[PDB]
Write a protein that binds this ligand. Structure first.
Ligand SMILES: O=c1[nH]cnc2c1ncn2CCN(CCP(=O)(O)O)C[C@H](O)CO
Ligand SMILES: O=c1[nH]cnc2c1ncn2CCN(CCP(=O)(O)O)C[C@H](O)CO
Ligand SMILES: O=c1[nH]cnc2c1ncn2CCN(CCP(=O)(O)O)C[C@H](O)CO
Ligand SMILES: O=c1[nH]cnc2c1ncn2CCN(CCP(=O)(O)O)C[C@H](O)CO
Ligand SMILES: [Mg+2]
Ligand SMILES: [Mg+2]
Lengths: 171, 169, 171, 169
């Protein structure tokens, strides 16, 4: 709770263009698989991104969601997937990776169910903060070490509905 | 699950146009409230609708989600945030019989929000078993079986950008 | 986290005797109903109490569990019942009621599903702290305004496994 | 769900006797560890067993619960507390095929507890599809269909104080 402003870091039209590209790449990757495919979103930050991305993926797939939450602390499953991923191409859709702990542990958890394949697509990557090295196949934007909001991403529950990515500026 | 096909019924552009109008209406009804606002989506069907709709709502608000299932309506995943004293708009993909939004409205009512309204993308008005008040409606449609824009048929077609009609063979 | 001791308030043999009585009363109440009956425990404090009580209930019933958690704050369902209670005699089994808010809201939530009947059985009642008046049909012990542990009830996660009820004494 | 009857197989007193021995064994194995201990029950079947067993364990520990379900093993309700760096004893009503405790052990393993052991009330050794290590066993039994002491038959008989055998007609 600090006096702040929001400033545009990635305008809406840039996000739209990037998601279109991610879309084409993802499609190219899975179009020939033949196995069932599911996009798994991590809630609730990733709802907007998932919504726009899955519309740009020209491959028949399912959409499902999982809610996880973690001074370390264990990553625990508040809400598991509705569907089985065994034998399917799974794509994990996340809003932001910075430390990597969360994606890292979630990938481990999902791998136990033996999907045909397992990959991650994150809209924003903040590598300056990476602690655990985790392989991310698809990245929309690598960004500077700034606290961003919008496009599903909140600051203290606020700003998820902004159609662009922006940064919180203090004082 | 039978052999079939999918035809466009509501093009992407018409949805986008309608959602913009819903945006203005919702903004208008809540612009002056002052209290905190939250849109609550019912997963999974409402996620896409929610994504486009909240972007058209020009009032500061929070976004939350809930997963309910039957039989008696049971909560698989409750809201993350409190809604007490707040303007709450439930966002849903379809109302048909009315059973779901009926029981969800009851449950959330107990938390004593400032206000409680419903916004549904699709209304099938016929076959209404329990009559629930819905303030905002995207489209009223006949008793057609549709898929797309979040709505599945046996887990398929959720990612279509249009509403489509399943055609059996 | 304070230096403390535990002292016996209700010895194990007293709890056993009381649960036996509660058992007989509950049995008397529902033996003629004919409708299905379910005992609903509130987790996780009530697991021990449920375990012992349901063994003293001579009526065919189901056992199910719910996990709820609440500066007020909303009572939210972390884990709902597995079974439907519509048309059944439902007995809510709780370890302690002191303020009453929790039982109060949980009863409201469960009533919406239209059980044949709805009642509460709590092992410990701390009425000096009652804020909301909530009707409790079955009570094991009304107790003084002391912080108790044991018999499923924790102090900072500690002491659930004690076979008796005791009080935490500071310094 | 067919017409049937229920006969005692393991009387209440024999269970109580066995659980006391399990108590001494578990206490012995963990008395000197120093690290924090937690018993983790898998709901619903294990709640009664857990209630009697934890009372016989003479080492400070926490009690936690987990609800899993299938197919792929999915978590309906995760633990409330962290188990990292702790001695964790999974408490379960029955191991048969081994699939359940297998996947649950994997999942919990990822949280990197100090140690990870299993205590099961009943072992049906036959029909073991995946071989999982179980440190503590109440009773090994034939491939009989039993109910009671937490164990249901179509949601019935969980509250019996003995283990019983269902007899079909
Ligand atoms: O700039 C930010 N805005 C808002 N949230 C952030 C930001 N930077 C990290 N977070 C937390 C995002 N994650 C942590 C990702 P990890 O460290 O495990 O790689 C928390 C959830 O994804 C919530 O979005
Ligand atoms: O054409 C359809 N496609 C896909 N789902 C449908 C359709 N017609 C009714 N449904 C079911 C919608 N359910 C039930 C609504 P209720 O009858 O309770 O008013 C809504 C659920 O949230 C699933 O989206
Ligand atoms: O002496 C106590 N020991 C341990 N926990 C307590 C005590 N007194 C109240 N609590 C909290 C118990 N409840 C609150 C009951 P409410 O105020 O809603 O009537 C919390 C859960 O039941 C956890 O057991
Ligand atoms: O006689 C029985 N009564 C009641 N349930 C049984 C019985 N025999 C196997 N089961 C199923 C026990 N499940 C599966 C154990 P797995 O085959 O995975 O090793 C255990 C679940 O936790 C349900 O209690
Ligand atoms: Mg559906
Ligand atoms: Mg069972």
């Amino acid at each position: 709770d600090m006096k702040h402003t929001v400033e545009v870091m990635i305008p809406e039209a840039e996000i739209k263009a990037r998601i279109a590209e991610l879309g084409r790449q993802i499609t190219e990757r899975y179009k020939d698989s033949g196995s069932d495919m599911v996009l798994v979103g991590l809630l609730r930050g990733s709802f907007m991104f998932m919504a726009d991305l899955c519309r740009e993926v020209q491959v028949s797939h399912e959409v499902d969601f999982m809610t996880a939450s973690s001074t370390t602390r264990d990553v625990k499953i508040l809400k598991d997937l509705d569907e089985d991923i065994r034998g399917k191409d799974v794509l994990i859709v996340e809003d932001i990776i910075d430390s990597g702990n969360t994606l890292s542990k979630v990938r481990e958890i999902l791998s136990l169910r033996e999907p045909k394949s397992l990959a991650i697509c994150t809209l924003l990557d903040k590598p300056s903060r990476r602690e655990v090295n985790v392989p991310v196949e698809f990245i929309g934007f690598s960004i500077p070490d700034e606290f961003v909001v919008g496009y599903g991403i909140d600051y203290a529950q606020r700003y998820r509905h902004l159609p662009y990515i922006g940064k919180v500026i203090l004082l």
